[PDB]
Design an enzyme around this catalytic site. Structure first.
Site, PDB file in Angstrom:
ATOM      1  N   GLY A  41       4.243   6.985  -6.959  1.00 33.50           N
ATOM      2  CA  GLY A  41       4.820   7.576  -5.759  1.00 33.50           C
ATOM      3  C   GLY A  41       5.365   6.538  -4.790  1.00 33.50           C
ATOM      4  O   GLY A  41       5.371   5.343  -5.097  1.00 33.50           O
ATOM      5  N   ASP A  72      -5.038   7.295   9.899  1.00 29.55           N
ATOM      6  CA  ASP A  72      -4.587   8.495   9.187  1.00 29.55           C
ATOM      7  C   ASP A  72      -5.560   9.294   8.328  1.00 29.55           C
ATOM      8  O   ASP A  72      -5.149  10.136   7.536  1.00 29.55           O
ATOM      9  CB  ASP A  72      -3.204   8.276   8.557  1.00 29.55           C
ATOM     10  N   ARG A 100      -6.078  13.355   1.400  1.00 29.54           N
ATOM     11  CA  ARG A 100      -4.994  12.806   0.584  1.00 29.54           C
ATOM     12  C   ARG A 100      -4.986  11.276   0.573  1.00 29.54           C
ATOM     13  O   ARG A 100      -4.338  10.661  -0.280  1.00 29.54           O
ATOM     14  CB  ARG A 100      -3.638  13.315   1.070  1.00 29.54           C
ATOM     15  N   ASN A 101      -5.698  10.671   1.519  1.00 28.49           N
ATOM     16  CA  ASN A 101      -5.821   9.220   1.580  1.00 28.49           C
ATOM     17  C   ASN A 101      -7.184   8.747   1.094  1.00 28.49           C
ATOM     18  O   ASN A 101      -7.630   7.645   1.423  1.00 28.49           O
ATOM     19  CB  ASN A 101      -5.556   8.719   3.002  1.00 28.49           C
ATOM     20  N   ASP A 145      -4.906   3.318   1.923  1.00 32.80           N
ATOM     21  CA  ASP A 145      -3.888   3.240   2.971  1.00 32.80           C
ATOM     22  C   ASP A 145      -4.444   2.946   4.355  1.00 32.80           C
ATOM     23  O   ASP A 145      -4.012   3.535   5.340  1.00 32.80           O
ATOM     24  CB  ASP A 145      -3.072   4.535   2.993  1.00 32.80           C
TER      25      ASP A 145
HETATM   26  C1  LIG Z   1      -5.258   4.623 -12.354  1.00 34.37           C
HETATM   27  C2  LIG Z   1      -4.757   5.811 -13.115  1.00 34.37           C
HETATM   28  C3  LIG Z   1      -3.678   6.575 -12.385  1.00 34.37           C
HETATM   29  O1  LIG Z   1      -2.529   6.646 -12.794  1.00 34.37           O
HETATM   30  N1  LIG Z   1      -4.088   7.135 -11.225  1.00 34.37           N
HETATM   31  C4  LIG Z   1      -3.330   7.959 -10.356  1.00 34.37           C
HETATM   32  C5  LIG Z   1      -2.424   8.938 -10.831  1.00 34.37           C
HETATM   33  C6  LIG Z   1      -1.719   9.723  -9.939  1.00 34.37           C
HETATM   34  C7  LIG Z   1      -1.896   9.569  -8.572  1.00 34.37           C
HETATM   35  C8  LIG Z   1      -2.778   8.623  -8.090  1.00 34.37           C
HETATM   36  C9  LIG Z   1      -3.524   7.829  -8.977  1.00 34.37           C
HETATM   37  N2  LIG Z   1      -4.400   6.860  -8.538  1.00 34.37           N
HETATM   38  C10 LIG Z   1      -4.216   5.832  -7.686  1.00 34.37           C
HETATM   39  N3  LIG Z   1      -5.066   4.810  -7.886  1.00 34.37           N
HETATM   40  C11 LIG Z   1      -4.935   3.751  -7.100  1.00 34.37           C
HETATM   41  C12 LIG Z   1      -3.915   3.732  -6.072  1.00 34.37           C
HETATM   42  C13 LIG Z   1      -3.086   4.846  -5.937  1.00 34.37           C
HETATM   43  N4  LIG Z   1      -3.248   5.900  -6.747  1.00 34.37           N
HETATM   44  N5  LIG Z   1      -2.119   4.914  -4.941  1.00 34.37           N
HETATM   45  C14 LIG Z   1      -1.434   6.203  -4.631  1.00 34.37           C
HETATM   46  C15 LIG Z   1      -0.207   6.477  -5.469  1.00 34.37           C
HETATM   47  C16 LIG Z   1       0.343   7.885  -5.264  1.00 34.37           C
HETATM   48  N6  LIG Z   1       1.121   8.096  -4.034  1.00 34.37           N
HETATM   49  C17 LIG Z   1       1.823   6.872  -3.623  1.00 34.37           C
HETATM   50  C18 LIG Z   1       2.701   7.142  -2.421  1.00 34.37           C
HETATM   51  N7  LIG Z   1       1.914   7.698  -1.320  1.00 34.37           N
HETATM   52  C19 LIG Z   1       1.894   7.196  -0.072  1.00 34.37           C
HETATM   53  O2  LIG Z   1       1.727   7.922   0.903  1.00 34.37           O
HETATM   54  C20 LIG Z   1       2.119   5.727   0.103  1.00 34.37           C
HETATM   55  C21 LIG Z   1       0.959   4.914  -0.420  1.00 34.37           C
HETATM   56  C22 LIG Z   1       1.144   8.875  -1.716  1.00 34.37           C
HETATM   57  C23 LIG Z   1       0.282   8.549  -2.916  1.00 34.37           C
HETATM   58  C24 LIG Z   1      -1.869   3.829  -4.132  1.00 34.37           C
HETATM   59  O3  LIG Z   1      -0.928   3.863  -3.362  1.00 34.37           O
HETATM   60  N8  LIG Z   1      -2.770   2.772  -4.144  1.00 34.37           N
HETATM   61  C25 LIG Z   1      -2.805   1.848  -3.069  1.00 34.37           C
HETATM   62  C26 LIG Z   1      -3.757   2.005  -2.075  1.00 34.37           C
HETATM   63  C27 LIG Z   1      -3.854   1.086  -1.045  1.00 34.37           C
HETATM   64  O4  LIG Z   1      -4.800   1.295  -0.072  1.00 34.37           O
HETATM   65  C28 LIG Z   1      -4.977   0.274   0.906  1.00 34.37           C
HETATM   66  C29 LIG Z   1      -3.018  -0.019  -1.015  1.00 34.37           C
HETATM   67  C30 LIG Z   1      -2.087  -0.194  -2.032  1.00 34.37           C
HETATM   68  O5  LIG Z   1      -1.265  -1.290  -2.007  1.00 34.37           O
HETATM   69  C31 LIG Z   1      -1.481  -2.267  -0.990  1.00 34.37           C
HETATM   70  C32 LIG Z   1      -1.982   0.731  -3.061  1.00 34.37           C
HETATM   71  C33 LIG Z   1      -3.767   2.553  -5.175  1.00 34.37           C
END
Ligand SMILES: *CCC(=O)Nc1ccccc1Nc1ncc2c(n1)N(CCCN1CCN(C(=O)CC)CC1)C(=O)N(c1cc(OC)cc(OC)c1)C2
Length: 290
Positions: free
Chosen positions: A21, A152, A156-157, A170
């Site tokens: 996403g 936030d 969802r987070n 997030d």
């Molecule tokens: C691991 C197997 C898999 O595919 N899991 C999965 C499948 C579908 C949705 C979500 C997941 N699992 C998941 N695991 C770890 C992280 C994430 N998801 N992130 C969310 C992605 C989905 N989407 C992204 C866009 N969005 C936003 O609002 C912006 C972020 C809505 C959610 C994800 O972003 N991760 C993440 C978390 C954090 O937290 C501080 C920081 C990141 O980069 C600095 C990334 C991890």
């Protein structure tokens, strides 16, 4: 960008896979990493990698560097998404974090709503629901002890691992506190205004107590199994209801102990809401009883 050997990971040890996403001022992609644990250099693991849009500019980059540096600082905890590594040298900026197998808590819960021998035994039980809340409170307590205000906090987070461990996501993002369109749905059709404490909403003031308010909304989401806060209420009406001091009703199939906790979290005065330490203890005693 400077080289930080404690966190730097060879980008060629990453194989980028399916997108998860966007809207993060970049984008998140599932990936396999080889040798994330250096004791086993050829072993594969599944991670998530955050990176910039391919048409991003210097503002998006500054933000991604900023979130990176925040996650370096807050350190590691069971109940947050943890930083694993970064790719900053000789190529695009990658931020490598844990990947949670079951997606976000809201969808986790909504997919597991019971039927309207074990014919009326749904996947979710009261003690596991309380565990979910207890874990989120534990992570927030950790985040608070590291001077991090989430701003936030919502189901969802919260991400869910294969072993049903809650991981707060997030928390290192620039929110744009002073230019929030309260009426605009996000990528989910979600309205983040419904999670904002009165002081943040009306006075643009964020504290750890502002996050406690959000936790109470998150509590409500858990025990409605992923319900939408203030059901059916347009944002315009939400403003009025909050000025009038109105609160959400007690949800069906929810014990008074937990609605009690919700209402404490929504006390108008931040100084009269529980701390996360208190929430953790109060939930733990419930978890001990059941
Ligand atoms: C691991 C197997 C898999 O595919 N899991 C999965 C499948 C579908 C949705 C979500 C997941 N699992 C998941 N695991 C770890 C992280 C994430 N998801 N992130 C969310 C992605 C989905 N989407 C992204 C866009 N969005 C936003 O609002 C912006 C972020 C809505 C959610 C994800 O972003 N991760 C993440 C978390 C954090 O937290 C501080 C920081 C990141 O980069 C600095 C990334 C991890």
């Amino acid at each position: 960008l400077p080289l930080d050997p404690l966190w730097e990971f060879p980008r060629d040890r990453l194989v980028l896979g399916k997108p998860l996403g966007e809207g993060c001022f970049g984008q998140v992609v599932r990936a396999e990493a080889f040798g994330m644990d250096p004791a086993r250099p050829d072993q594969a693991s599944t991670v998530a990698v955050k990176m910039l849009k391919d048409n991003a500019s210097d503002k998006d980059l500054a933000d991604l560097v900023s979130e990176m540096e925040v996650m370096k600082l807050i350190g590691r905890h069971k109940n947050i998404i943890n930083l694993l590594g970064v790719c900053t040298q000789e190529g695009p900026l990658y931020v490598i974090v844990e990947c949670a197998a079951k997606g976000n808590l809201r969808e986790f819960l909504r997919a597991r709503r019971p039927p309207g021998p074990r014919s009326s035994e749904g996947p979710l039980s009261f003690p596991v629901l309380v565990s979910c809340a207890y874990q989120v409170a534990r992570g927030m307590q950790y985040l608070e002890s590291r001077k991090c205000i989430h701003r936030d906090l919502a189901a969802r987070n919260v991400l869910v691992t294969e072993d049903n461990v809650m991981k707060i996501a997030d928390f290192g993002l620039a929110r744009g506190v002073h230019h929030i369109d309260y009426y605009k749905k996000t990528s989910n059709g979600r309205l983040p205004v419904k999670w904002m404490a009165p002081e943040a909403l009306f006075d643009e003031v964020y504290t750890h107590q502002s996050d406690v308010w959000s936790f109470g909304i998150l509590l409500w989401e858990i025990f409605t199994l992923g319900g939408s806060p203030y059901p059916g209420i347009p944002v315009e009406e939400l403003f009025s209801l909050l000025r009038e001091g109105h609160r959400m009703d007690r949800p069906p199939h929810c014990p008074p102990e937990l609605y009690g906790l919700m209402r404490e979290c929504w006390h108008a005065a931040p100084s009269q809401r529980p701390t996360f330490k208190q929430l953790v203890e109060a939930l733990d005693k419930v978890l001990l009883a059941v």
